[PDB]
Design a protein around this nucleic acid. Structure first.
Lengths: 51, 676, 747
RNA sequence: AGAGAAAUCAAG
RNA sequence: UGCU
RNA sequence: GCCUGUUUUUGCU
RNA sequence: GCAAAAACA
RNA sequence: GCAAAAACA
């Protein structure tokens, strides 16, 4: 449960963290992308800023 | 017209957009509707026989005519009973999945139909006030009439409503008591006449016709009955290839394209209309078709009786004559009833019932669009016809795939005759067949290689709506966006429509030139920052779907300090008169009630600047609905199912809310003390 | 405070009772009828009054407020001269919103962010898509229903109301409603609407959430192999004259669900009568916390295995017949595509029966591949006409050969051999290679003409000039697109073949044994413990965890497992057990220990610790033993094959840990001593008054405390779930009764 | 007057 | 009292 | 004044 | 669910 | 966001 939220790191990335934890527990260190991963790794951030 | 017929770059099909005088005024009707109503009454009698014999046609109850009596050189009113039976049998034998869906609807969907669906209608004739009233008002007063004449409560289902309607017909005298106080009396004959009465009235702002036509509206005593048959007809039509009425928009175009397969030697394409529709269709033919459908389905007798009630009531219809035919002595103008002095409608005097006139033939009104479509489609099912047919109500398109031209002509004539067997006459001047297929029209959709976009069918929607700047801008831009998506408007037309709409929208809100609003903004140093305030457009062709405020915030055109003021949920401009309830996700108290305002300060309400008891009753219903919604958050997501009456249900709910409020016990006691 | 809400509700109830003495004698269920009575909001032609209405002296109607000055800089902002009603009656000047744009009270930035949340999502979604290069060109539209806007989570329509109920008002729900809700969507929606519900009313927030999890498909003309997955950008990225190239992936779990369904189908085809095996397994597998039936209903994809599993659950499938890269759709046909068991006696001992499919009677099939679009008409195995709408100079080798294979038109293959037959896939590959290097069968089947108007060149190219042209191949004169009118209902074969109900028989749609797809990742959160195929997991840890959760939590499964391992009988988990334990020599000692533990304690299958010990002994017993080594005593603990995970008999460490308070299997607390629901709950009672047991706040609140009796509230009724004492579920008892009836019927 | 078209507005 |  | 049926767009409960 | 608008028959 | 006199995203 989130205590402090920062605008730099949105609290929605906890979904990415828990997905990675579950995938690693299931013997899969590498997992497919999810929607919360969009604003977690700056995917298409260069194009967004440029446009 | 030579300027509308290009020969080199584009074809005339693409220039069919130019054959539209829209953006010009739409014609209106001015005077008495009596002549039009009487003409619609007399036309079915003129078409029953090959030689018009009106006097010999008025004594006919069921219009059934021998195959040698069917007119082939003109409109033919009536049907062939054996033809209807055999064609309905053929239509049932084929399209078995459609009949299975009909059985599914009868068993499952029909019992769950609620009579509140009748409230969705527009102006409805009221048998109590003898006027046209909004559908909710007429429905509620009819429900009260049934409740206080049957001394019982009417179930929410439509079957219970129809059973109550049938039960009231069994009484000798019925009374209506309503607040102004006033009491009105109905005999069985009087209430029967009011049941079978259609209120006639002009159709205004109708484009595409030289002569004004008359529309009619039935009472709530028969709209419920028509609802069942219309829903069943829709259920059947959604599952048959030959129908075109229940689908619309792009789905209708896809269905049409699924049939534009021209592979044989001679591939025709017949597109035409049916003349004198809604008045050459005897309701008894629809009765027979529905009865055959229900017999071959194994349905019991009660459903057959229910399906047959509306068509008999329309067989006994009483069309409301207007305020009289116009008579002149010199340059005088006087309006007189039908039977006062001779006219061209003297043969119909015997059908006059007060101010209404009876007509046993035809439908007189498009209350059975889906059932008439089914009647048209059953006639198609025969061995001779091998082409693809699409029929909506009276506009049809047919595709032929024949080896020889003579075979195609024989098939076309067989189509005409089989349509005439059930009382449907092809309009000879409106039906055109192209022997090599590829060019046609259906529902004003012209196709040559693909369904070409039709500009000027979207122009009437380009005017600002007049609610408030945000809603007007949003819906105008989204209408333009839908027109672009459907192919009606391309890039250039879409952008030009955006510019025209924006300019008119800024004008309508006093944002152009020197106005009072602009002067006030100038003298007080108020920069616009919004489209409705005179700022530069933020929306583009690719950003039609984006909200103005969000896009301006993203682009930096609207700073956060002004955003904190525009989107204030406590602004006086859009403040509500009463407190509203709010959810609280994962909180000790999940519901909080507090005063609220619409977030945008530009979503204000414009004053409109100018059966009363029933309106106060609507207000009481609204208050009860509001308190129920406040106390029962779960009826907002699912249907209400709590037991008991409203008072006790909300009393127990309010209690249970209190004991979960996490307060002191004695405080809960003092709160419960003042509950009524 | 919290008391103000109760005060307001009490006063509203009292006023509504006093002001409306009637309208509450009606039943509460009459709300569904009288909520629609909202007349006096009707208006006619507001657009014909806007110009005058704005220019009226006092156009704006608002409630009386003191935040708007009566006169500001010489302009009279508000008018209170008339005050006919004095409530919602004062009128404001048109410049009042303009005045409020400045000189106005502000609001926290959090509120502004919450209000613009969905619109901001749309704006960032627009500015995050790669604006590619415009490719102008003539386009043949394809009309299909497409999703209006993207959804944070896709949920089947039946589960949307329950999801919303769990999001907004959990206190007025039952355990069945909670079970029918998509909990992932519930969590996402709660996180999203935590700030939004503070600025939106109840119904506004409810329907915002609904829109966030509702598909709302709408028909639009699209471009083939250019579907933007959502009509949000169709005006920008698509038209009849251009498309904007974009690079967007699926980012959806439909591929993983396909992988899971494919594994289930492949392992089900290896058993007796695969249909009921697949149906039973699909009713015992849960992805995350959602049952497999519900997640299959959620994902309505085009994929084959997903379609097979959806048909097995009674749902529909959108899959279309695909050959290589060309999609085929039968517009209309006289009879379903029949199959011929062409047996090939090339050798006496070596013979293979390779079946092909063809047409009988007349048929018309639409085909699409890349930008090539059109239809062809055939009679039996003879092509009558072909009409193609393709770009100029395009190579039409692969689509035409896919058509020929689809109709079995050309006859070098199918009934013949063009060379010994061996397997379907090899024969198909040989067919395609032979006709790729020798594409003359099409020309000798269709014929040649010297007319220059015909666009199909002898080298199977579009509009390229040549001396001769392929006969009966013309341009697509009018747009043609598949469309089904009647709601198609699908039939699943006993060998897991998906059929479509054609008029004169059954039309094959999906057929395994030629669906070629490599293995992929399983969906996260997949639970195969209750299923018969645990070896689907490729991880030894997951395999062992699922097997142990299956044995520990259920006594009957432990009985069956121990019995099969001890007596060397066939077991559903033989492969998993063999793959978990290394090649050892402890089988005889394990079987012994099984013997003494069974004889000493006939009542062993009630203590989960005893079940754990018996499961360990049975797993070692059913292991792959070594021949050339003498048997040794069973060890206290061993290591899983190809792993460093320790499995211990005493369950003090490693994969299974059984503390006094609880048992942990693979890091997860499978069983709790006093607070748990392993055997589940049953409803047992619906009442209009509270029963004589505790009333929990929410269904999940009562699921955590683990009381022997608790109630929940749902629309004025109380549902008091107590406990399940039966050792079997409804589903398998119904299965047993149905099989007993059918196993008395067979004589 | 005029607008207009199968009969209305141009007052009560 | 101000739409190109 | 302003019917029935289908489709579409927007906003609010 | 309601309200407004538009197209077609 | 990382990082500093502008590169990655």
């Amino acid at each position: 449960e989130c205590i402090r939220e920062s605008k730099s790191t949105p609290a929605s990335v906890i979904t990415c963290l828990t997905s990675s934890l579950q995938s690693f527990a299931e013997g899969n260190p590498v997992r497919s992308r999810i929607h919360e991963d969009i604003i977690a790794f700056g995917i298409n951030k260069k194009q967004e800023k440029k446009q | 017209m030579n300027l509308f017929t290009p020969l080199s770059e584009i074809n005339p099909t693409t220039t069919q957009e130019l054959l539209y005088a829209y953006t010009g005024p739409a014609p209106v009707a001015y005077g008495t509707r009596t002549r039009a109503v009487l003409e619609n009454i007399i036309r079915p009698y003129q078409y029953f026989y090959k030689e018009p014999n009106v006097q010999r046609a008025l004594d006919i109850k069921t219009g059934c005519k021998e195959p040698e009596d069917i007119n082939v050189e003109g409109p033919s009113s009536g049907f062939h009973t054996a033809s209807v039976l055999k064609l309905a049998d053929n239509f049932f034998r084929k399209y078995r999945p459609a009949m299975e869906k009909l059985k599914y609807w009868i068993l499952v969907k029909l019992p769950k139909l609620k009579y509140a669906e009748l409230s969705k209608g527009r102006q409805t004739y009221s048998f109590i006030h003898k006027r046209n009233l909004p559908a909710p008002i007429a429905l509620e007063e009819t429900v009260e009439f049934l409740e206080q004449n049957l001394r019982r409560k009417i179930g929410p289902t439509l079957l219970s409503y129809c059973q109550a309607i049938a039960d009231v017909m069994e009484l000798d005298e019925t009374t209506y008591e309503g607040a102004r106080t006033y009491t009105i009396k109905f005999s069985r004959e009087e209430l029967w006449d009011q049941m079978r009465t259609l209120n006639t009235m002009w159709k205004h702002l109708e484009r595409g016709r030289l002569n004004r036509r008359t529309i009619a509206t039935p009472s709530m005593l028969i709209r419920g009955f028509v609802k069942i048959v219309e829903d069943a007809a829709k259920e059947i039509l959604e599952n048959v290839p030959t129908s075109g009425v229940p689908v619309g928009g792009e789905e209708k175009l896809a269905k049409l394209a699924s049939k534009q397969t021209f592979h044989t030697a001679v591939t025709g394409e017949l597109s035409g209309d049916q003349e004198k529709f809604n008045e050459c269709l005897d309701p008894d033919a629809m009765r027979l078709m529905w009865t055959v459908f229900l017999r071959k389905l194994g349905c019991p007798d009660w459903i057959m009786e229910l399906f047959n009630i509306p068509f008999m009531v329309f067989k006994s219809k009483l069309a409301d004559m207007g305020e009289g035919l116009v008579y002149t002595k010199g340059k005088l103008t006087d309006r007189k009833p039908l039977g006062e002095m001779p006219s061209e409608f003297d043969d119909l005097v015997r059908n006059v019932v007060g101010n209404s006139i009876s007509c046993r033939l035809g439908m007189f009104m498009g209350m059975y669009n889906l059932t008439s479509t089914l009647l048209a489609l059953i006639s198609i099912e025969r061995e001779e016809l091998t082409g693809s047919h699409v029929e909506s109500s009276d506009d049809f398109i047919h595709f032929f795939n024949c080896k020889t031209h003579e075979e195609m002509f024989k098939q076309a004539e067989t189509l005409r005759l089989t349509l005439k067997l059930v009382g449907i006459n092809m309009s000879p001047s409106k039906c055109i067949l192209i022997s090599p297929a590829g060019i046609g029209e259906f529902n004003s959709k012209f196709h040559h290689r693909d369904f070409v976009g039709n500009v000027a069918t979207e122009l009437p929607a380009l005017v600002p709506n007049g609610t408030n700047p945000m809603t007007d801008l949003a819906m105008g831009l989204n209408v333009i966006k839908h027109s672009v998506n459907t192919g009606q408007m391309n890039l250039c037309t879409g952008a030009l429509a955006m510019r025209i709409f924006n300019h008119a929208y800024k004008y309508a809100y006093m944002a152009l030139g020197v106005t009072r609003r602009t002067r006030f903004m100038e003298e007080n140093a108020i920069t616009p920052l919004l489209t409705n305030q005179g700022a530069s457009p933020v929306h583009s062709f690719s950003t039609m779907h984006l909200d103005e405020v969000a896009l301006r915030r993203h682009l930096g055109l609207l700073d956060e300090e002004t955003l904190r003021r525009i989107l204030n949920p406590n602004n006086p401009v859009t403040q509500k008169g009463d407190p509203s309830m709010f959810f609280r996700i994962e909180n000790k108290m999940p519901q909080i009630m507090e005063d609220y305002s619409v977030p945008s300060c530009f979503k204000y309400t414009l004053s409109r600047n100018r059966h009363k008891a029933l309106l106060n009753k609507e207000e009481r219903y609204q208050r009860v609905t509001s308190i129920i919604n406040k106390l029962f958050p779960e009826v907002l997501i699912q249907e209400a199912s709590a037991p008991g009456t409203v008072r006790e249900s909300l009393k127990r709910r309010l209690e249970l809310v209190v004991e979960r409020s996490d307060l002191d016990e004695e405080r809960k006691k003092r709160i419960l003390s003042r509950i009524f | 405070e919290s008391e103000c809400t109760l005060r307001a509700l009490v006063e509203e109830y009292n006023g509504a009772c006093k002001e409306a003495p009637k309208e509450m004698s009606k039943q509460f269920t009459d709300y569904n009828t009288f909520k629609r009575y909202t007349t006096s909001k009707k208006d006619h032609a507001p657009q014909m009054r806007l110009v005058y209405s704005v220019r009226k002296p006092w156009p704006i109607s608002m409630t009386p407020s003191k935040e708007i000055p009566l006169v500001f800089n010489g302009t009279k902002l508000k008018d209170t001269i008339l005050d006919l009603g004095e409530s919602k009656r004062t009128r404001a000047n048109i410049v009042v919103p303009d005045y409020w744009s400045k000189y106005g009270s502000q609001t926290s930035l959090e509120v502004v962010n919450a209000i613009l949340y969905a619109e901001d999502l749309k704006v960032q979604r627009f500015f995050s898509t790669e604006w590619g290069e415009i490719r102008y060109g003539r386009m043949l539209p394809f009309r299909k229903p497409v999703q209006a806007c993207p959804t944070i989570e896709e949920v089947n329509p039946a589960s949307i109301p329950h999801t919303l109920l769990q999001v907004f008002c959990p206190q007025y729900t039952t355990l069945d409603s909670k079970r029918k809700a998509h909990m992932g969507a519930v969590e996402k929606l709660k996180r999203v609407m935590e700030p939004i519900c503070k600025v939106q009313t109840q119904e506004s927030a409810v329907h915002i959430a609904r829109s966030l999890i509702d598909s709302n498909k709408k028909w639009l003309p699209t471009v083939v192999d250019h579907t933007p997955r959502t009509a949000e950008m169709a005006h920008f990225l698509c038209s009849k004259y251009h498309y904007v190239h974009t690079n967007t992936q699926d980012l959806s779990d439909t591929r993983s669900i396909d992988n899971l369904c494919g594994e289930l189908v492949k392992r089900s085809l290896k058993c007796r009568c695969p249909k009921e095996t697949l149906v039973a397994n699909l009713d015992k597998i849960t992805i995350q916390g959602r049952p497999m039936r519900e997640v299959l209903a959620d994902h309505d994809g085009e994929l084959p295995y997903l379609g097979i599993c959806r048909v097995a659950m009674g749902l529909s499938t959108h899959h279309t017949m695909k050959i290589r890269s060309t999609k085929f759709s039968i517009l209309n046909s006289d009879h379903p595509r029949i199959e011929v068991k062409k047996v090939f006696s090339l050798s006496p001992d070596v013979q293979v029966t390779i079946p092909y499919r063809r047409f009988k009677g007349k048929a018309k099939v639409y085909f699409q591949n890349d930008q090539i679009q059109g239809y062809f008409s055939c009679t039996d195995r003879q092509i009558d006409e072909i009409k193609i709408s393709a770009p100029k100079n395009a190579p039409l080798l692969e689509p035409l050969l896919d058509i020929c294979y689809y109709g079995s038109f050309i006859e070098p293959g199918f009934e013949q051999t063009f060379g010994y037959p061996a397997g379907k896939r090899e024969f198909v590959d040989s067919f395609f290679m032979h006709h790729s290097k020798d594409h003359k069968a099409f020309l000798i089947h269709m014929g040649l003409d010297k007319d220059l108007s015909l666009p199909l060149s002898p080298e199977l190219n579009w509009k390229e000039p040549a001396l001769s042209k392929v006969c009966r191949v013309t341009e697509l004169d009018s747009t043609v697109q598949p469309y089904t009118s009647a709601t198609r209902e699908f039939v699943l074969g006993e060998t897991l073949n998906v059929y479509t109900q054609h008029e004169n028989g059954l039309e094959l749609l999906i057929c395994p044994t030629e669906i070629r797809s490599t293995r992929g990742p399983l969906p996260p959160g997949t639970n195969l413990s209750g299923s018969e195929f645990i070896d689907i997991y490729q991880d030894p840890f997951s395999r062992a965890k699922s097997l142990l959760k299956s044995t520990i939590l259920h006594a009957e499964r432990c009985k069956e497992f121990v019995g099969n391992m001890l007596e060397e009988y066939q077991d559903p988990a033989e492969t998993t057990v063999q793959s978990l334990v290394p090649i050892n020599t402890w089988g005889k000692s394990a079987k012994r220990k099984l013997q003494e533990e069974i004889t000493s304690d006939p009542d062993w299958h009630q203590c989960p610790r005893k079940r754990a010990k018996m499961s360990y002994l049975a797993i070692i017993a059913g292991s792959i033993q070594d021949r050339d080594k003498k048997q040794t005593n069973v060890p206290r603990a061993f290591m899983l094959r190809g792993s460093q995970i320790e499995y211990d008999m005493k369950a003090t460490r490693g994969l299974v840990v059984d503390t006094t308070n609880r048992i942990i299997v693979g890091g997860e607390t499978v069983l709790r001593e006093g607070k748990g629901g392993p055997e589940g709950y049953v409803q047992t009672g619906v009442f209009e008054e509270q029963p004589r047991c505790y009333l929990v706040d929410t269904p999940d609140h009562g699921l955590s405390m683990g009381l022997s009796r608790f109630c929940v509230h749902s629309q004025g009724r109380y549902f008091q779930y107590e406990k399940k004492i039966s050792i079997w579920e409804e589903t398998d008892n119904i299965k047993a009764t149905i099989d007993s009836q059918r196993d008395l019927k067979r004589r």
